[PDB]
Design a protein around this nucleic acid. Structure first.
Ligand SMILES: Nc1ccn([C@@H]2O[C@H](COP(=O)(O)OP(=O)(O)OP(=O)(O)O)[C@@H](O)[C@H]2O)c(=O)n1
Lengths: 49, 1052, 86, 49, 98
RNA sequence: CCGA
């Protein structure tokens, strides 16, 4: 409920439902992290997992 | 709001909820056999009425206490036996309506202690330059401290309070967590697994055996019970409500506030924060920040002392239940109240926090209750007090006054709460702020009371910014404080603003007008001298004030305040009666000539008359240093800043005789004398009229029992209580034997032991109360009767008395002149006091000239101004323009045009009283508010010819009360050695101290007019020789004479 | 027996300790009976001893105080600084 | 004239100027800044003798 | 004294040469041989948790409100999810009542 | 605790 402003805003959402047949070894859910502004991405460094 | 609200709220919290938690953590107790159970019903605890009230407890040297009864219930495990009985548990002294306590006939305050708050704190210590290493510290409210470490290699080391360093994985597996949730809980597991290999990974049973190998036959069940008793048990580890709150706040948890023990999730989160601090995320904490420091008032300290006493009491009850094999007891037999009474009496008698009260004037009484001290048990040591703990922090702005502090060795340790400050429910100090929206100060509702939430978040402006009324903040730059830095921003970016320009200062500093034109050290001196003024006979309000005087007089407690609407029906000097209308007569008692702690008067006078309406909150009676419902510490007198003929040379003071004959600066001081008729082995001491070696007319004021009467005049050496004691040795020398052989002279069996007036201390006897055990009283043991005598005296102003203003301008009166010799004004009015003008620009207190000029304008107008400090927000040179405009308007009166001269504004022409000639230059005259301090010359003059001596050293005693001598210390010996003066130094060390034969020989040679003989070895050197011999050292003096060595005998 | 023979500078005999304990029990029982107004006359009655003897026992039961104890809440004063040599 | 700059109780130098004298009167910010140097003088008098 | 400029972005080195040191305890320290300038090319930086992973590559324009990062919430041996009255992400929880 |  309390979020960081510099990191971003997240979605609470579940891709599976109550009583859903999920296979083992797969994903449960995921979130996004919001982008306040638009533009082109610079950044990503070498060798980082 | 009230100013002593912290004391009132803390004692109300103790009486409502604080004691119930102790009585609920107390119950239930059990025996080792498991057959008896005793539990205390704490919610229905009862308070008896006090045996005596405030004044009858003050004059009897007793406490103002209540009896506290907690009803118990004995349930039985063999049968249905329910035994319920009210049980006395101890004596609790009650807080009075002024917020004080009465312990052994003296008023006492419990000052507020500032300590480190419970919670987790991180710091960054480092090597020579080395590695940035981080350390944690988990502080509970009560219990062991959990600390964490990182070295240069990066090992996470945990330690307990005094032990050596062991590994955090060993601690975590000693708890019982799986290794799954440990590294599944962490954010960066690669940093922690680096420490996993070098330290190793133990099993749950393997970890329990190696803490016992370090904390202390290594066993795992013993170590499991050990760690369960250290951190996870109640009544041996309390994290506290504030500790749970701050630990949830720092580590971002939503753990329930009812849990007051430490959990392994908390240690996992602290390990996570410490690891994440090595990757540059998170914030290290400050130890002097006021968000990490809380205030402990009288509720918490009573709760802790009652916890210790209840631990002793339940140990006693468990031992008494385990020893007794026979059952069917009463609940009043198992409870021994003496450890709880002993703990409460120890807390209220012999604590650093329990202080003898400053009761000089209402301002000192109000300031002592708002003191914030950092010393005491659980606080600080004065030897461990560095410079950083005495520095001023930016978080102190608005909360702790930067000016008011002691000048002695405890400078920066004992602080003062500011004016608008307030302590919240968790113990942190908060200050009110107005909201600011779109550049406009809001001022629509109550303020916010930010509890140091304004450093990292808000931009806060002071309350002296210029602002047009019902409008925005004018100017494009607003001074703000932000992230503990001063800066300037636009008014549309300001979040909060202060509510008052005097929010930064305390009450006594807010008493000072034109504070911004004085130096801060002089403001400190002015506050300190304002707390030292004596209440005068006819108090008078200042012609220039600030506006807090009425609230200070209301919240001191020296003012009878009305409560209901009504009509006053009867007023005399001792009683005000009023029927209320909106058990139909309220009687307000008025105290008459009582004694304070500092031997000053506590007198009240009525203000209302018979037959007028009274609003609730109306002042009915005013106190000793209070008139008109406002604080009145001194008088308004006519100054002239000019030098006299060397009589105001170096801060000396010249005054006139009008301040003597007009009863200005006349005060009342009441001294108290006590004598006990003790029980001696040789016989009982009796208080009688028949005293040996006492003449005829030395017994006129004594009654038939040998005690003085009320209203008698006594001087130095007069007998107050005649007492004798049965001496029984009767070893007479031959001189006395021959003199009693010649002239009769039957030697009596008793000797004189009467109570006499000391040197000085003349006055009138006003109260001769006598306490006797067969009258209904009960005494200290071994004393038959106790007589208490109160002697009052009116002290006029004198040469040698101390005098001060509100701007740190102290001085000693050195000359009292007649009014025909004092300088006079061009209307013929003489000057009351001449102050030296050279003490102003070197000491840099310019506000006294502003105050005297404004007071003289108000004297010539008759208006009694009131000016709040920092008044330069309304314009440039606002104080100067106000003062000179009011002086011009006072000079526009039809008869008084000599008051102001436009050629030289603050000055006028002054004539000489002796010659009639005017002085060559115009002189600043005015009306200043001067004060009379407790430092009078009668309490300072002392002299000794020969008195008592010390036990072992046989040197003269010290102190005025025991006729002691002055100490000739080592620096005085160096000063005499830097001269010649070997004979002065030799007689100062031998025949004036600890050489008894030299003492007797010197006194006999001076009395018979002969030469003083040569002294011998002093007594303390022989004591040192015997002490060095008793240490086991063969030390001896030797003497050489004609090829011979011999050991000398110094004991002779 | 070691408590009653040592641990006190001016030592008291064993019968004095048992008399002090008996006086404590008697005062607590007569305070349970008579709830208010404690009475040394009935304390001396229930112990069958003289009241000045009871005062002697209560006077001998006091503990001594050291001459090196500080008077105030500081280290500037000492109890031996106020004792005059006889 | 002007008061200029104050000093910390340890000898450190503050960052802000005081552009007023005692005749014109200091502000609240300047009074806190002057209180820093007053605490310097008091603590040093109490501790270096 | 530390130079603390208040602007987030990517660091660029102009006329700056580093120097790596070895010390007693193992200190990795960067020294300037000759003093130069340090430039920061401005841009808003978003700190992601270490359990997350970005989707957008090293050069791609982002639209309004588009996805920036999504992580893998992967726990094993679970087939059917059943919840009653909480958020409480859980297991199949085949519990019995006799 | 305060005073110099
Ligand atoms: N802890 C202290 C405080 C004061 N003194 C002595 O007391 C004197 C204090 O002088 P005082 O009249 O209190 O202050 P002034 O220096 O005269 O300054 P002002 O006129 O502003 O009061 C000092 O010279 C010093 O010798 C001391 O020995 N130790």
């Amino acid at each position: 409920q309390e979020s960081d402003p510099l990191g971003g805003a997240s979605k609470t959402r579940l891709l599976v439902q109550d009583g859903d047949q999920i296979p083992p070894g797969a994903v449960v859910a995921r979130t996004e992290i919001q982008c306040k502004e638009a533009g082109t991405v610079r950044g990503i460094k070498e060798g980082q997992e | 709001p009230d100013l002593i609200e912290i004391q009132h709220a803390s004692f109300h919290w103790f009486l409502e909820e604080g004691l119930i938690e102790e009585l609920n953590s107390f119950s239930p107790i059990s025996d080792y056999t498991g057959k008896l159970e005793l539990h205390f019903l704490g919610k229905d605890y009862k308070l008896k009425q006090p045996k005596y009230d405030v004044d009858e407890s003050k004059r009897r040297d007793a406490s103002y206490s209540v009896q506290m009864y907690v009803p118990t219930r004995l349930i039985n495990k063999e049968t249905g036996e329910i035994k319920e009985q009210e049980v006395f548990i101890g004596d609790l002294p009650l807080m009075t309506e002024r917020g004080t306590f009465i312990i052994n006939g003296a008023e006492r305050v419990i000052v507020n202690q500032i300590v480190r708050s419970p919670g987790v704190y991180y710091k960054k210590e480092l090597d020579k330059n080395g590695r940035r290493t981080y350390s944690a510290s988990l502080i509970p409210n009560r219990g062991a401290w959990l600390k964490f470490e990182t070295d240069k290699n990066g090992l996470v080391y945990v330690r307990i309070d005094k032990t050596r360093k062991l590994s955090a994985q060993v601690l975590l597996k000693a708890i019982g967590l799986s290794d799954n949730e440990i590294l599944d809980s962490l954010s960066h597991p690669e940093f922690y697994q680096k420490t996993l290999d070098k330290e190793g990974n133990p099993t749950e049973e393997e970890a329990l055996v190696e803490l016992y190998k370090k904390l202390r036959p290594p066993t795992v069940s013993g170590g499991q019970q050990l760690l369960e008793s250290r951190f996870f048990d109640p009544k041996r580890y309390d994290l506290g409500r504030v500790g749970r709150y701050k630990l949830n706040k720092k580590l971002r948890l939503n753990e329930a506030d009812t849990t007051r023990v430490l959990t392994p999730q908390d240690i996992l989160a602290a390990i996570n924060y410490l690891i994440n601090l090595e990757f540059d995320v998170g914030t290290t904490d400050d130890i002097d920040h006021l968000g990490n420091r809380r205030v402990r008032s009288v509720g918490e300290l009573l709760q802790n002392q009652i916890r210790v006493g209840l631990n002793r009491l339940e140990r006693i009850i468990r031992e008494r239940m385990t020893v007794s094999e026979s059952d069917a007891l009463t609940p009043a037999s198992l409870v021994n109240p003496k450890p709880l009474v002993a703990a409460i009496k120890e807390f209220f008698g012999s604590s650093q926090l329990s202080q003898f009260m400053d009761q000089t004037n209402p301002l000192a009484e109000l300031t002592h209750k708002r003191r914030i001290s950092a010393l005491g048990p659980g606080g600080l040591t004065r030897e461990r007090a560095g410079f950083a703990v005495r520095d001023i922090h930016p978080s102190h702005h608005g909360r702790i006054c930067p000016v008011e502090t002691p000048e002695g060795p405890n400078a920066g340790l004992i602080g003062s709460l500011a004016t608008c400050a307030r302590v919240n429910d968790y113990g942190f100090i908060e200050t009110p702020y107005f909201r600011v929206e779109s550049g406009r100060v809001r001022k629509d509702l109550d303020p916010v009371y930010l509890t140091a939430d304004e450093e990292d978040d808000m931009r806060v402006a002071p309350g002296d910014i210029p602002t047009d009324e019902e409008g925005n903040i004018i100017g494009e730059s607003v001074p703000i404080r932000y992230r503990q830095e001063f800066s300037t921003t636009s008014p549309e970016q300001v979040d909060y603003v202060a509510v008052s320009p005097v929010q930064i200062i305390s009450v006594a500093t807010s008493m000072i007008p034109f504070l911004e034109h004085d130096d801060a050290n002089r403001a400190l001196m002015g506050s300190n001298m304002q707390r030292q003024a004596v209440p005068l006979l006819r108090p008078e309000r200042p012609l220039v004030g600030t506006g807090l005087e009425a609230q200070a007089a209301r919240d001191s407690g020296m003012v009878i305040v009305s409560r209901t609407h009504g009509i006053v029906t009867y007023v005399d000097a001792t009683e005000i009666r009023v029927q209320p209308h909106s058990g139909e007569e309220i009687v307000y008692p008025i105290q008459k000539y009582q004694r304070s702690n500092q031997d000053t008067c506590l007198n009240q006078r009525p203000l209302v008359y018979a037959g007028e309406d009274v609003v609730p909150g109306q002042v009915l009676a005013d106190g000793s240093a209070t008139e008109g419902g406002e604080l009145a510490l001194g008088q308004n007198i006519l100054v002239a800043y000019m030098p006299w003929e060397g009589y105001n040379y170096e801060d000396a003071i010249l005054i006139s005789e009008r301040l003597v004959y007009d009863d200005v600066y006349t005060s009342i001081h009441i001294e108290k004398f006590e004598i006990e008729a003790r029980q001696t082995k040789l016989g009982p001491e009796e208080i009688t009229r028949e005293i040996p070696n006492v003449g005829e007319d030395a017994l006129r004021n004594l009654d038939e029992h040998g005690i003085i009467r009320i209203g008698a005049w006594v001087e130095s050496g007069d007998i107050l209580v005649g007492k004798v004691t049965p001496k029984g040795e009767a070893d007479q020398p031959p001189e006395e034997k021959l003199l009693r052989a010649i002239f009769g002279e039957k030697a009596r069996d008793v000797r004189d032991n009467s109570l006499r007036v000391p040197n000085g201390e003349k006055g009138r006897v006003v109260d001769v109360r006598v306490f006797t055990r067969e009258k209904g009283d009960e005494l200290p043991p071994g004393a038959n009767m106790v007589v208490r005598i109160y002697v009052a005296q009116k002290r006029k102003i004198q040469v040698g008395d101390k005098m001060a203003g509100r701007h740190g301008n102290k001085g000693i009166i050195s000359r009292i002149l007649p009014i025909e010799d004092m300088p006079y004004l061009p209307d013929g009015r003489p000057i009351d006091i001449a102050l030296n003008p050279l003490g102003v620009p070197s000491r840099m207190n310019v506000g006294q000239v502003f105050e005297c000029l404004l007071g003289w304008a108000g004297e010539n107008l008759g208006v009694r101004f009131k000016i709040t400090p920092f008044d330069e927000m309304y314009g440039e040179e606002a104080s100067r323009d106000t003062v000179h405009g009011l002086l011009e308007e006072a000079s526009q009166r039809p008869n008084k045009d000599w008051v102001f001269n436009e050629n030289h504004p603050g000055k006028i022409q002054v004539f000489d009283g002796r010659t009639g000639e005017p002085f060559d230059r115009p002189i600043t005259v005015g009306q200043a508010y001067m004060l009379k301090l407790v430092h009078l010359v009668d309490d300072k003059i002392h002299a000794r010819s020969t008195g008592p001596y010390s036990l072992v050293t046989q040197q003269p005693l010290g102190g005025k009360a025991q006729q002691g001598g002055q100490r000739f210390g080592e620096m005085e010996v160096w000063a005499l050695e830097a001269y010649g003066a070997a004979y002065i130094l030799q007689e100062l060390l031998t025949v004036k101290s600890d050489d008894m034969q030299g003492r007797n020989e010197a006194l006999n040679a001076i009395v018979k007019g002969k030469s003083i003989p040569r002294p011998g070895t002093p007594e303390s050197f022989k004591v040192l020789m015997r002490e060095l011999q008793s240490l086991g050292l063969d030390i001896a003096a030797h003497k050489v004479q004609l090829s011979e060595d011999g050991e000398s005998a110094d004991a002779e | 027996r070691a408590i009653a023979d040592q641990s006190r500078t001016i030592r008291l005999p064993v019968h004095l300790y048992e008399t002090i304990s008996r006086i404590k029990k008697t005062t607590k029982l007569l305070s349970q009976e008579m709830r208010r107004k404690p009475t040394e006359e009935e304390i001396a009655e229930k112990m069958e001893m003289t009241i000045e003897k009871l005062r002697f026992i209560a006077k001998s039961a006091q503990l001594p105080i050291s001459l090196e104890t500080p008077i105030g809440k500081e280290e500037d004063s000492r109890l031996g600084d106020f004792i005059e040599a006889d | 004239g002007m008061r200029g700059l104050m000093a910390d109780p340890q000898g450190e130098i503050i960052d802000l100027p005081i552009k007023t004298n005692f005749r014109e009167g200091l502000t609240v910010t300047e009074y806190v800044i002057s209180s820093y140097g007053a605490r310097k003088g008091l603590v040093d008098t109490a501790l270096r003798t | 004294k530390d130079v603390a400029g208040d602007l987030a972005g990517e660091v660029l080195f102009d006329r700056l040469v580093p120097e790596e040191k070895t010390d007693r305890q193992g200190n990795t320290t960067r020294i300037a041989q000759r003093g130069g300038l340090v430039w920061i090319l401005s841009g808003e930086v978003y700190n992601l948790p270490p359990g997350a992973e970005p989707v957008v590559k090293n050069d791609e324009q982002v639209e309004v409100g588009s996805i920036m990062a999504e992580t893998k919430l992967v726990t094993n041996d679970g087939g059917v999810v059943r919840l009653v009255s909480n958020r409480e992400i859980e297991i199949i929880t085949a519990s019995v009542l006799l």
